[PDB]
Amino acid sequence: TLTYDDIVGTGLANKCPTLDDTARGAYPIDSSQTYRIARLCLQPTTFLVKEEPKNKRQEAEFVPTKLVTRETTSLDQIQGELKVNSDGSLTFVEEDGIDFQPVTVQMAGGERIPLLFTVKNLVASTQPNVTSITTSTDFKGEFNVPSYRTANFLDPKGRGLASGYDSAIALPQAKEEELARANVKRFSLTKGQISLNVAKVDGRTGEIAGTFESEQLSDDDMGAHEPHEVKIQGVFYASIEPA
Amino acid sequence: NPMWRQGMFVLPFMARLGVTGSWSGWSITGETGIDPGFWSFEGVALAHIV
Amino acid sequence: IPEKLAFYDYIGNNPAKGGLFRTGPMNKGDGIAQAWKGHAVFRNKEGEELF
Amino acid sequence: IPEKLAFYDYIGNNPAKGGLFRTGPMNKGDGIAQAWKGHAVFRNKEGEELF
Amino acid sequence: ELVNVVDEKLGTAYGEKIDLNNTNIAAFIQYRGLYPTLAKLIVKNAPYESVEDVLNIPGLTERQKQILRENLEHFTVTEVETALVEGGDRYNNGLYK
Amino acid sequence: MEPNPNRQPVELNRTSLYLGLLLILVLALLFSSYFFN
Amino acid sequence: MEVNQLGLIATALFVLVPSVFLIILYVQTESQQ
Amino acid sequence: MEVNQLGLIATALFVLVPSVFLIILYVQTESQQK
Amino acid sequence: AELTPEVLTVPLNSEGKTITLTEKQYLEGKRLFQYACASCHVGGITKTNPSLDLRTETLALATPPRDNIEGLVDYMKNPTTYDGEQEIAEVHPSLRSADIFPKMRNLTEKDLVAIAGHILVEPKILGDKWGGGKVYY
Amino acid sequence: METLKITVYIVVTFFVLLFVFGFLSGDPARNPKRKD
Amino acid sequence: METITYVFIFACIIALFFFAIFFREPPRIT
Amino acid sequence: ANLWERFCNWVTSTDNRLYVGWFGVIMIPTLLAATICFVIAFIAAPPVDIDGIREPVSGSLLYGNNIITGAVVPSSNAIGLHFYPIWEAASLDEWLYNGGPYQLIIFHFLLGASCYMGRQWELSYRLGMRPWICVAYSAPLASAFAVFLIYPIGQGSFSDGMPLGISGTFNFMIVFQAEHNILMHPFHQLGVAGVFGGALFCAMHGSLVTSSLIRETTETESANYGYKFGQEEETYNIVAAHGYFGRLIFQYASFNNSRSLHFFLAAWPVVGVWFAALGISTMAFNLNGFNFNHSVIDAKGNVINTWADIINRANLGMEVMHERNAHNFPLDLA
Ligand code: CLA
Ligand code: CLA
Ligand code: CLA
Ligand SMILES: CC(C)=CCC/C(C)=C/CC/C(C)=C/CC/C(C)=C/CC/C(C)=C/CC/C(C)=C/CC/C(C)=C/CC/C(C)=C/CC/C(C)=C/CC1=CC(=O)C(C)=C(C)C1=O
Ligand SMILES: CCCCCCCCCCCCCCCC(=O)OC[C@H](CO[C@@H]1O[C@H](CS(=O)(=O)O)[C@@H](O)[C@H](O)[C@H]1O)OC(=O)CCCCCCCCCCCCCCC
Ligand code: HEC
Ligand SMILES: CCCCCCCCCCCCO[C@@H]1O[C@H](CO)[C@@H](O[C@H]2O[C@H](CO)[C@@H](O)[C@H](O)[C@H]2O)[C@H](O)[C@H]1O
Ligand SMILES: CCCCCCCS[C@@H]1O[C@H](CO)[C@@H](O)[C@H](O)[C@H]1O
Ligand SMILES: CCCCCCCS[C@@H]1O[C@H](CO)[C@@H](O)[C@H](O)[C@H]1O
Ligand code: OEX
Ligand SMILES: [Ca+2]
Ligand SMILES: [Cl-]
Ligand SMILES: [Cl-]
């Protein structure tokens, strides 16, 4: 039970809470009660990026990468409704929280891959018939991945979507067709997928923990280039409460 | 696109004797996430300049 | 057939096809190889395989 | 209007628009001039002429 | 395929009126009685299929509905534009004075 | 330092200069086409 | 003509480097007593 | 980077011509009867 | 140009009764506005909430209307949000909150009238510069 | 990184000790004139 | 080519510093 | 003699081609480390996220710079004043992304240059000279401290230290004007009088001495051969020099005491440059240049602009544009 001053600068603030090996119980679901996730935490331990090989034929593989933006990657303080469905499955509907982190990783050879690691607007559901959440429960869901930069962001020549120049002003008489992809900024919105595999349950407290894997696109630099496919693996923590 | 398609002359001599990785993480046989230690291609170049 | 094996069976990789003043990487001539097109089989109207 | 007169009324021919290390002919910047596009008249939805 | 969606939006009713589905909250200061109380409710409860659906926000007082009706003529709705509503931008769009 | 007694003066007479410049300029005239290719 | 763009610097140094070597040697021969 | 294709020869001659002038002068000063 | 009685004549209320401020009144208003208000409202903007300025057209559309002496004096006793719905003395300087905003402790009715008069006269002099922010500096 | 840290700490300490013991080694007397 | 050029000129300057200091014309009182 | 005594003798030896000395023992390794890292980083370092907004700026030659645009870029705003040595990073890749080279370079450079100044004291003592050459060097040293250390401390980040590059220096200067109106600060004004005055007195002194050299050479020889290193006699006529300058202005405006003259040459640029350094070092704590914006008002209350107000318009342009993605709130408070 630690204070800020115990934690500040250790790296522990980017780590999700854990559960003891003894937490292999079952958290009862009373189909009559309303429920919430009062805290969801996601702590990535690995970023993989799918390679883009020269001929489609040979499946491209996800390869390991080097994190260059330090211990700034976790999602936390996320909350929302935990619905009990007709078939006894549960559906988590994310309402709010620190549900995104920009992250840059680096491929072998140095190429940097920024991504907006996120679960924004996550809707994730368990199997049917979850009378108790146990270490057999899984959540599978989809979430939105908005553009890594938001609409005000200006490039190094001052061009932007909701602000900025709309041409390459340093090349006043250049033909504009060849610069259209750089000049006309576009705002991506794509889908990601995540699975949460419950490995530990404290039936008393309503806390669960486990591992996650999500898949999503990386930054496209407001439409300047094609995004990469990213797979994030890590651990998660959630506390469930009667709402 | 191996080294001999790219006009590389000393790279194959480093490779022949066991220097096959870069500090930036790739290897000549197409690996990723390798740690060559000091004796990467860059470490060999630096040693010769010193 | 591995792409690598097919690529060795191509004259653009033969070292006896160069010129004294054709300078630089092999890639500067035929280009940077991207993909094997596959093996071409030629046939005439009768359908006989031709080489 | 003679194309030659229109061309004088264009800033790419103004000698105070260059750079000390932007070298060579004017044609190297804006290009080799081919034709006058004609005089552009801008109007808003009300039909008022704008400049 | 390459169009600036914010400039395009300027050519719709978004460019003429307060778009209940997209416009940043500070715009509601242009008319008596809308800011901050009704402004907050309107942004919180967007999007609206038509301007008059703004009268149906749960928990509006009777006086609020009347203020809303008086200002329907200054409102529009257009399709929600991701670029204008992501980033918390309806509540602070990076512009001050 | 004591002087090094192995030092010798070097010479290039005017004829040698001319012969040498002719060699270089003619080699350049011959090889330049191949360098431009 | 689409010539090799290093042709000019290759040619210029091919001439200048040995020509100047010779000129250096000639001039300091002339200046000897 | 799409640099000016004459920048290399210009820099090289800029360096070489005056440096060679000075070298010529220095060596023929050294070779003068001391 | 001069600071004339005309320049100095401003609405006292919403019915269009006017008051002609004296020069001493104007100058006292400027001085008191600097003392009590300019840390947030220099030049007619609002540093801690730039969406709301002190332009006369803005004040006119406040609820209750604030484009007159009496409206401004009332604001300084009991400030509200722009729609009139919430009283904001706990976070905004007023006579009602002089316990927590001590620079309001000794202000008289005549002082508030003066600050109000400065707020209404300044745009008549400065035009769009008043409440305009850095664009108009 | 730990090995690098220790190495640099050792290096720095070594030089800093040279500086301190160096200036303690009768420095006022290392001048060409009065040596006490 | 530009990078080579800049580094080459720089390297020559450092070489010059070495010769100017260690192979200077020695100061001699006469 | 002891091993230690022989070493101390060598360290402090007056006969080493370059003096070593106790300050030298710290100066040599620190300057070499700063230099080596500077040169490798200027050539080959990848882009650095200076403003902590994941917007990396390319400073190196191999990543698209030339001599003029290239720089070692300041460490990330996310770091602030935190100490970021190599071993605090998870990897060299991270260290490079975050501007680690800049910290390593500046801290070794400032230590090594401080020791350079001590070394100038030290050798003067070993040689039986008077001791204050080091005091003249404290002027440029104090200025390097102002831009690499004191300014970052005041502003709370090394991301606001001067970049190690030519265009980056100009960037620092322009942002400083926008944030401090340094042109309107009297210590920067003293700095300018110091360096313009330094240059004027440099040219003056050189021309006056050169004007009065005693004839010792023929027309075909450089006059410089008329002076032999270590000769006892003065090589020019200071009375003739004074006779010219005294009449150029008036007699009392001229120095005929060479010691007073040379003192003045030292003191003018050195004091002015101390004040330049103290300008940067006190604008570091935001006590800024004179602000006469709207100082002049007409009978009605209309602002009558002066040249100060025109300066203010230029400063506004710099202010609103700089670090165009970094500010979310309306005031730039550091
Ligand atoms: C500590 C010393 C050391 C080490 C470990 C290396 C290591 C390396 N060098 Mg460097 N090198 C060094 C010193 C060293 N070098 C020195 C001093 C020079 C200056 C001459 C060089 C100049 C150099 C060049 C120019 C090149 C390298 C290259 C290389 C690489 C390939 C080596 C190779 O193919 O050798 C092959 C060596 C031989 C085949 C040796 C032939 C031996 C002959 C036949 C001996 C005959 C005489 C003997 C007395 C006969 C009797 C013997 C008796 C047993 C009977 C390797 C990373 C290559 C490279 O990749 O560069 C980046 C390359 O091109 N080096
Ligand atoms: C054993 C020596 C050797 C060999 C085999 C190679 C081989 C190679 N190099 Mg390396 N290289 C070398 C030494 C070598 N290099 C040296 C010493 C340098 C520093 C100059 C370089 C710098 C270098 C660069 C910068 C590059 C290469 C590249 C290459 C590739 C293309 C080569 C090419 O186009 O040649 C062309 C060869 C010729 C045109 C033949 C020249 C014949 C001369 C001019 C004849 C001179 C005649 C003389 C004047 C007559 C005198 C007559 C008198 C006696 C009377 C190839 C792998 C290229 C590559 O792809 O890099 C990835 C490349 O970019 N090299
Ligand atoms: C009066 C002199 C003069 C003028 C005004 C021109 C004008 C022109 N020429 Mg011509 N030219 C000249 C002399 C001149 N030329 C000479 C002497 C030659 C033989 C070298 C040429 C050969 C030439 C060619 C081959 C070409 C031109 C072209 C042109 C056009 C483009 C010029 C340009 O890009 O400049 C660029 C100018 C600069 C980048 C300025 C150089 C600044 C120097 C490097 C500063 C040096 C500083 C110094 C070292 C500092 C010392 C410090 C120390 C004391 C301490 C322009 C109409 C171009 C054209 O379009 O032709 C159709 C073209 O292709 N000219
Ligand atoms: C048409 C009509 C009417 C015609 C009539 C013309 C006529 C005959 C007029 C006569 C009447 C008359 C005289 C009228 C005067 C009118 C008038 C006042 C005009 C204005 C003139 C004017 C404002 C002049 C400006 C003077 C001025 C600013 C001078 C410079 C002063 C100054 C700041 C000097 C620097 C200070 C200083 C102490 C410098 C010394 C540092 C220095 C140079 C060191 C170098 C140095 C110095 C040495 O000393 C020697 C030795 C050596 C070695 C050496 O290194
Ligand atoms: C409200 C009122 C109160 C005012 C108080 C203000 C406080 C300010 C303190 C100022 C007083 C200090 C005077 C010290 C004089 C001095 O230096 O003596 C040392 C010598 C002795 O003079 C020499 O005098 C010598 C005799 S002796 O040394 O004095 O004994 C003699 O031999 C020689 O010929 C003669 O030249 O003075 C000189 O060399 C003359 C040079 C002229 C002045 C130089 C000092 C200032 C230059 C720096 C200016 C920087 C600002 C510019 C920034 C860019
Ligand atoms: C900062 C701490 C402030 C000081 C000091 C003063 N005011 Fe203010 N003012 C401030 C804010 C954040 C707001 C908006 C509050 C809200 O939620 O609506 C205001 C608003 C006003 C207004 C209303 C403007 C309008 O267009 O309706 C007025 C008339 C006003 N303030 C006057 C005023 C005076 C006279 C002050 C000194 C006595 C003063 N304010 C101080 C912030 C701050
Ligand atoms: C960019 C390409 C550059 C190529 C550069 C080539 C460098 C050429 C270096 C040649 C140097 C010749 O070296 C020079 O030799 C001469 C004699 O020849 C020496 O001269 C010595 O002998 C001569 C002749 O008896 C005496 O008069 C003289 O007093 C004595 O010093 C010089 O002291 C030496 O400096
Ligand atoms: C003296 C050599 C020191 C210079 C080392 C440069 C870093 S190493 C360098 O890094 C790049 C990007 O990470 C890679 O693309 C490249 O293949 C690799 O050689
Ligand atoms: C002058 C360069 C000094 C930098 C040295 C970095 C050493 S790093 C060191 O190098 C070894 C090489 O065999 C490896 O085995 C080891 O795993 C690696 O960490
Ligand atoms: O980081 Mn560089 O620059 Ca000193 O102000 Mn704030 O922060 Mn940023 O902005 Mn303006
Ligand atoms: Ca499980
Ligand atoms: Cl900036
Ligand atoms: Cl901010």
Q: What angle do the packed helices G7-30 and F14-36 form, to 10 degrees?
A: 180
- Domain residue spans of chain I: 1-137
User: For residue A35, which of A89, A84, A95, A86 has the smallest C-alpha distance?
Assistant: A84
Please state whether at least 3 CB pairs lie below 8 Å between chains C and E.
Answer: no
CATH number at A176 reads 3.30.2050.10
Distance CA L205, CA L212 (A): 11
Length of chain L measured in residues: 334
Token code pair at residue A95: 């309402």
Question: Which residue range is the domain that position L252 belongs to?
Answer: 1-334
Place of tokens 């010792």: L216
Query: Is residue D50 within 8 Å of residue D43, measured between CB atoms?
Result: yes
Taken in order B25, B30, B36, B39, is the CA torsion positive or negative?
negative
E57 near E28, Cβ under 8 Å? no
Give distance in angstroms: CA of C24 to centre of ligand 2. 9
C-alpha span between I117 and I94 (Å, rounded): 17
Q: Specify whether the CB–CB gap between L110 and L149 falls below 8 A.
A: yes
Q: Which CATH number fits domain I1-137: 2.60.40.1180, 1.10.760.10, 3.30.1540.10, 3.40.50.300?
A: 1.10.760.10
For L38, other C-beta atoms within 10 Å of its C-beta total 20
Using left for φ > 0, alpha for ψ between -120 and 50, and beta otherwise, residue J4 falls in alpha
Whether A158 sits inside 8 A of L94 (CB atoms) is: no
Do A180 and A199 share a structural domain? no
Calculated CA dihedral for residues A78, A84, A86, A88, nearest 10 degrees: 110
The per-residue b/e assignment along L91-112, b for 16 or more CB within 10 angstroms, e otherwise, is eebbbbbbbbbbbbbbbbbbbb
CA angle, residues A33, A39, A43, in degrees to nearest 5: 140
Closest to E28 in 3D by CA, of A80, I61, L157, G32: I61
Residue with tokens 């004549």: I9
Mutate to test the pocket of ligand 8, among B10, B11, B14, B24 (most ligand atoms within 8 A of CB): B24
The whole-angstrom separation of Cα L198 and Cα L136 is 13
Q: Measuring CA to CA, how many Å separate E88 from each of A31, A72, A149?
A: 35, 21, 13
Identify the CATH number of the domain in which residue A223 sits: 2.40.160.30
Ligand 1 atom with the smallest distance to the CA of B17 is 31
CB atoms within 10 A of CB L272: 22
- Which residue from C minimizes the CA distance to A57? C35
The 3-state secondary structure of chain A reads: CCCHHHHCCCCHHHCCCCCCCCCECCEECCCCCCEEEEEEEEEEEEEEEECCCCCCCCCCCEEECEECCCCCCCEEEEEEEEEECCCCCEEEEEEEEECEEEEEEECCCCCEEEEEEECCCCEEECCCCCCEECCCCEEEEEEEEECCCCCCCCCCCCECCCCCECCCCCCCCCCCHHHHHHHCCCCCEEEEEEEEEEEEEECCCCEEEEEEEEEEECCCCCCCCCCCEEEEEEEEEEEEEEC
Instruction: Please judge whether G28 and H28 are an interchain contact, meaning their C-beta atoms are less than 8 angstroms apart.
Output: yes
Residue L277 φ then ψ, to 5°: -60, -40
CA L301 to centroid of chain Cα atoms: 44
Domain that holds residue A238: 21-149+186-243
CB contact (8 A) between residue A114 and residue L78: no
Structure tokens at E24: 């940043």
Q: Tell whether L332 is in a known binding site.
A: yes
* Contact criterion met (CB below 8 Å) for E90 and E82: no
H or E element in which residue I114 lies: helix I109-126
Which among E20, E13, E21, E24 has a CA at the least distance from the CA of E68? Answer: E20
Does residue A126 belong to any structural domain of this protein? Answer: yes
- The answer to whether the CB of L154 falls within 8 A of the CB of L161 is no
Q: Which residues pair with A80 in a beta bridge?
A: A37, A94
- State which amino acid sits at residue F6: N
I104 vs A67: CA distance, rounded Å: 54
Is residue A234 situated within a structural domain? yes
Task: Give the CA dihedral A26, A31, A36, A37, nearest 10 degrees.
Answer: 30
Helical (H) or strand (E) element with E75:
strand E75-76
- The values of phi and psi at residue E41, to 5°, are -65, -40
Which technique was the structure solved with, according to the deposited record?
X-ray
Neighbours of A92 (CB within 10 A): 26
Say yes or no: A96 and A130 in one domain.
yes
Rounded CA-CA distance L37/L43 in Å is 10
**Rounded CA separation E26/L148 (Å):** 42
3-state SS string over chain L?
CCHHHHHHHHHCCCCCCCCCHHHHHHHHHHHHHHHHHHHHHHHHCCCECCCCCCCCECCCCCCCCCCCCCEECCCCCCCCCCCCCHHHCCCHHHHHHCCHHHHHHHHHHHHHHHHHHHHHHHHHHHHCCCCCHHHHHHHHHHHHHHHHHHHHHHHCCHHHCCCEEHHHHHHHHHHHHHHHCHHHCHHHHHHHHHHHHHHHHHHHHHHHHHHCECCCCCCCCCHHHHCCCCCCCCCECHHHHHHHHHHHCCHHHCCCCHHHHHHHHHHHHHHHHHHHHHHHHHHCCCCCCCCCCCCCECCCCCECCCHHHHHHHHHHHHHHHCCCCCCCCCCCCC
Q: Which residue has the tokens 């209350």?
A: L301
Q: Which residues of K fall within a CB distance of 8 Å from H1? A: 2
* Residue J5 near residue L4 (C-beta atoms within 8 A): no
CA distances from H2 to D29, E33, H5, K1, L64 (A): 15, 59, 8, 11, 10
Quote the longest CA-to-CA distance of chain F.
54
Residues with Cβ within 6 A of ligand 6?
A: I 36-37, 39-41, 46, 48-49, 52-54, 58-59, 62, 66, 72, 75-76, 81-82, 88, 92-93, 115
What number of other Cβ atoms are within 10 A of residue I79's Cβ? 20
**Residues contacting residue F25 through CB under 8 Å, at least 6 positions apart:** G15, G19
Q: Which of L61, G18, K8, G25 is nearest to H14 (CA)?
A: K8
Provide the token pair at L200: 């004027």
Comparing C-alpha atoms, which of A188, A181, A196 is closest to residue A228? A188
| Joined tokens for residue E15 | 């460019």
Structure tokens at A202: 């404290």
Instruction: Tell me the HSE value of L207 on the side-chain side, using a 13 A CA sphere.
Output: 8
Gaps in chain D (C–N > 2.5 Å) come after which residues? Answer: none
Q: What token pair was written down for A92? A: 């988590």
What is the number of domains present in chain L?
Answer: 1
d(CA B48, CA B41): 11
C-alpha span between L274 and L288 (Å, rounded): 17
**Dist. CA L323–CA J18, nearest whole Å:** 45
Domains assigned to chain E = 1-86 (1.10.150.320)
**CB of L163 closer than 8 Å to CB of L58:** no
For I20, the enclosing helix (H) or strand (E) is strand I18-20
Domain count, chain A: 2
Same domain, A177 and A72: no
Beta bridge partners of residue I19, listed in sequence order: I10
Q: Is A57 exposed, middle or buried (0-12, 13-18, 19+ CB in 10 A)?
A: exposed
> Nearest 5 degrees, angle CA I57-CA I63-CA I64?
100
The residue among B23, B24, B28, B31 with the most chain A CBs within 10 A of its CB, best to mutate, is B24
Contact I10, I21 (CB under 8 A): yes
Interatomic CA distance for residues L65 and L72, integer angstroms: 11
Residues A179 and A220 placed together within one structural domain of the fold: no
Rounded to the nearest angstrom, the distance between the alpha carbon of A198 and the centre of ligand 11 is 4
Burial class (CB in 10 A: 0-12, 13-18, 19+), A157: middle
* φ, ψ of residue A117 in degrees (nearest 5): -70, 115
Question: Closest residue (by CA) to atom 3 of ligand 6?
Answer: I40
For residues A85 and A180, membership in a common domain is answered with no
Q: Are residues A138 and A206 in the same domain?
A: yes
Does residue A122 sit in the same domain as residue A190? Answer: yes
Please report the atom of ligand 3 found closest to the CA of residue D21. Answer: 39
Query: Rounded to an integer, what distance in angstroms lies between the CA atom of residue E47 and that of residue E76?
Result: 11
Spell out the residues 6+ positions from residue B40 whose beta carbon is closer than 8 angstroms to its own: B19, B21, B22, B23
Q: How many CA atoms lie within 13 A of J27 on its CB side?
A: 14
Amino acid at J12: V
Which residues 1-37 of F have a C-beta within 8 angstroms of G?
9-14, 16-17, 20-21, 24-25, 27-28, 31-32, 35-37
Cα G24 from Cα F17, distance rounded (Å) = 10
Asked if L152 and L160 count as a contact pair (C-beta separation under 8 A), the reply is: yes
Hey, how many other C-beta atoms are within 10 angstroms of the C-beta on A69?
A: 22
